[PDB]
Design a protein around this nucleic acid. Structure first.
Lengths: 64, 59
RNA sequence: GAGCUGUAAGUAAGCUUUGAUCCAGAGAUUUCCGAAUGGGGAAACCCAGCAUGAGUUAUGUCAUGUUAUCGAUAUGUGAAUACAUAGCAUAUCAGAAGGCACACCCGGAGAACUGAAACAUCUUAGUACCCGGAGGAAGAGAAAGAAAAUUCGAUUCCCUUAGUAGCGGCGAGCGAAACGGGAAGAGCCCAAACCAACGUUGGGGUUGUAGGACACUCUAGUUACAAAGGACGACAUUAGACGAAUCAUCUGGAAAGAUGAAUCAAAGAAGGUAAUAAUCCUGUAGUCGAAAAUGUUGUCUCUCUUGAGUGGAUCCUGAGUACGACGGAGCACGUGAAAUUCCGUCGGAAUCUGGGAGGACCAUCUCCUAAGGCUAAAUACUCUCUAGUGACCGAUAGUGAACCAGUACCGUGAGGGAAAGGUGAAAAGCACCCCGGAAGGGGAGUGAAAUAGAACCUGAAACCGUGUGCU
RNA sequence: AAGCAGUAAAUGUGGAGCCGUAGCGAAAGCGAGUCUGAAUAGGGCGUUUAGUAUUUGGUCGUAGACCCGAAACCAGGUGAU
RNA sequence: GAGGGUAGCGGAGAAAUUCCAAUCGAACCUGGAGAUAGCUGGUUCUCUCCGAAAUAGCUUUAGGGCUAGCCUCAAGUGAUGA
RNA sequence: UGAGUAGCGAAAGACGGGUGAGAAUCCCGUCCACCGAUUGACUAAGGUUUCCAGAGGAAGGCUCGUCCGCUCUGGGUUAGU
RNA sequence: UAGGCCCAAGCGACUGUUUAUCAAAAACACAGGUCUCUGCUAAACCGUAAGGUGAUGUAUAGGGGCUGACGCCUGCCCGGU
RNA sequence: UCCUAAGGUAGCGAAAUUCCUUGUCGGGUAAGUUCCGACCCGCACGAAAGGCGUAACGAUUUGGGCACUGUCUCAACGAGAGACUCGGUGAAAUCAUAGUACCUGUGAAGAUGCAGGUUACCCGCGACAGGACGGAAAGACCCCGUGGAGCUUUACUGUAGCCUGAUAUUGAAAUUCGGCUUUCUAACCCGCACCACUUAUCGUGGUGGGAGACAGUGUCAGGCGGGCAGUUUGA
């Protein structure tokens, strides 16, 4: 029948105009005393999903 | 054959849950008491629940 | 409207134009077992009571009715125990039971293998299996609704919303509704106030723009819900009847083929006939037709029938109900901030200046009026009957079964389960002679053909034999 | 699309609905520009701004999913000749 | 010897994991059912062109998988290759 | 294919006369051999016509068969104790 | 047709029973000893309801554990369970 | 002198128990790792998962004797059935095709089939068992699979039961700091006696006794629980 979206993946990415996916960074939940100021300030910025990862998870998000 | 002669209450069925959310089948019985109540003829003992014994019921 | 006595041929004896056989409607007969029901029992068996009759000097034997249990109703009806009440006896009952299509529907109860690459929450799944109750459908159904517009107005089914909102060891995974577009489309009856009669039965009364009671002037048959028995013409189904048009030659065993002359068509669908037929046969298009039975509809008869606004002093509008705590379940929603609704236990309201809902909760606004009942249509399925269809099979295929198949056979039992089609157009199925005890064969005949002779259309390979060129 | 009409057709009719013409941001929101930020200061994603409907071929997902093969588990029955 | 009783989440056992229809560390039959199988075996006609790997990282991972490296086809830039 | 190979399921037969297409194997006779707390006579269970007579030799009989528990046709089971 | 006998040692008192189909034994049972539970709708067992066994019995009786004829005996320890 | 609850008593002991071990000494034999009798450095006996003995019994396990014998030195002869020849009838496991020699080498490291050499005219019948890693059973040993089943426990999570408290059924009086505690009878209970249905004491009803707001039963809660169930136990 109809394909099913990955609900856990649709909560973590967004679709851009060119077709890429915008993601958020890891290693930012707690234990901030063990990371330097430069590390924590540069983990506030966003990133994009790599093409290596895109080749594997593109079908899981097709309606998004 | 165990049922309330007036209200019609009887047993149910459900689950028993542990702290880990395991489940097994169990039953919920009714508080049926054997009483003598006036019928057209001789008073015969029937099963009547306690809920039907409130607010005034013949005995 | 001329043959017939089923496969099936055989002989024997018969019936039929005074209408056989055969086809359709309506009847009568219908052994025994089986729910099996007089009792018993290892189904298809044995043994009885009572009342009538046949036969006998009489007994013994026979025939026809009736005799289960439970349930509902009239009747006689001591008990223990004065009265009464269990029990008991007889009568009446198209009262019940069992089977069923391993399909569709509603309810009770309810797994596991599997996935999560292990597994316990979760998933498989409210699925398989079991039990009960039905119907031709069932279930649901006339707002204590959906919502936020200048609002709609019972239920069911399809399209979309949408793999969206959400749920989730937030893992695997699960997954909506309202709006809008369509199919189909009617709504109603009770309890209470209150009045009249001897607790009873009649009348009055059914709601949210607030209705009803009381007091004020007062008259459309819907037999599918809405109240329930019947006489009253047209069709359909179950046997059937008419129904156009071609001749000649050649090959051949046989012409429908080839070659020439024609004809019909509201009929050139199909099947057969000695090979390939619009004009040979059964048919086709189109018309005609019903003793009798059943179904569906319509026309009187027939049967019920009370209608709306103004006044609201006062009265009524469903109770151990709603709801709360504890333990569960169901809502797409795993207890989570969980509304909305169901079960068991324990508590437990209000009365129109009332009650509920709008996703914990309070206030304001908007919508509705729970705790009684009934209801066609659009929807699901096919054990079947009738008439048809296919870029579906063609005997190791197609149903397990084209043939005497749920059969041979196998098992104590539940249960498992095959193989096997084809002469010829027509039996015209080889009279007769020869070898032999017979099977088998060689001639002679039938036939277009017998290397088509029933172990019979065609007749491949493996394998087995006889005779021969070169070695 | 459902539905309706039509020979179980072709295609009429049907504009609920869907994709595209504009992005960015968690959201309120603004808009050829938006987010972060005191500050286009710098930086990220956009300003290409041609799609859309049917269909042949390749591959994927949900269904047993290229074929044959377990040791086992669960449910209802049959058996003490 | 004859007639009977106890049935598989069970029965019987002077006790051996012994027996319950030639089968028992849990009987047989029919269903869930085409259970699951990262494991063996198999997979049917013909030509033309090109043509590998047996490595790294991570892994309840080690004869399994995912990304990168190496092969092929289509489009683009074009001198960036040796 | 193995291959005209293994086997042919505990044991004493010989002769004469018949029948016959065909006789080590069928019928008749004589002699000899074996059992005899049984290889004898009844009979329950179980089987279900295997019982008798007249015919037959396709298949079954571990060889043959003119013969049979095999094939065809016709028969046979009688209770007040 | 019909016991071979003797002298010593281990294990089990004895007669019995057992792996149908590779184990018949020193293994199981046994008569005896001991501990413990049970006042009668007894304890224990099957269903885990009704109804039953125990038992138409009543502590010289009934259920469970260990040991195992007979003779001499059976020593120390209550931190731990 | 250290520790602990106690530090093994009587009996027995190279034992169905002893590794060293064929312990050491005697008996038996020409010769004794087995056997019998003693000794005790008991790796690691021991008192009801009993210790030490013990007539009778055993298709039990051991060691030594008399008698006997083809078991043997060391084999030979005879009888019968099969086997061998002939008449009748007539299968099976196995099998890629086969005109299928030896030696030394070589090869996936043990060749009828490859190299070099040496032997050998074609076809049968009776015998033997060296090879064809000979045939019958997808190795039961070993390892692997995030395969399965049975069993155990102070592995994890549950559960059938069995104890305990609150609350409903559940009532009337009266002492004491609505409650502990005492009497009573009407609820509820009796596999207690008698009567009736009724030829039955299963059941029901009645009447006497016993017990009594307890017990039994419903809902909620805490504890015990390998009796039973589902699973995990790394590379």
């Amino acid at each position: 029948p109809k394909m099913k979206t990955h609900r856990g993946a649709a909560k973590r990415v967004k679709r851009t105009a060119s077709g890429q996916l915008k993601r958020s960074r890891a290693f930012t939940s707690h234990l901030f005393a063990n990371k330097s100021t430069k590390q924590k300030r540069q983990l506030r910025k966003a990133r994009l999903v790599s093409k290596s990862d895109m080749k594997r998870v593109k079908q899981l998000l097709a309606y998004k | 054959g165990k049922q309330c002669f007036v209200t019609g209450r009887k047993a149910s069925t459900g689950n028993r849950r542990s702290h880990a959310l395991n489940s097994t089948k169990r039953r919920w019985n009714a508080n049926l008491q054997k009483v003598r109540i006036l019928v057209d003829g001789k008073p015969k003992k029937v099963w009547v629940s306690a809920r039907a014994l409130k607010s005034g019921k013949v005995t």
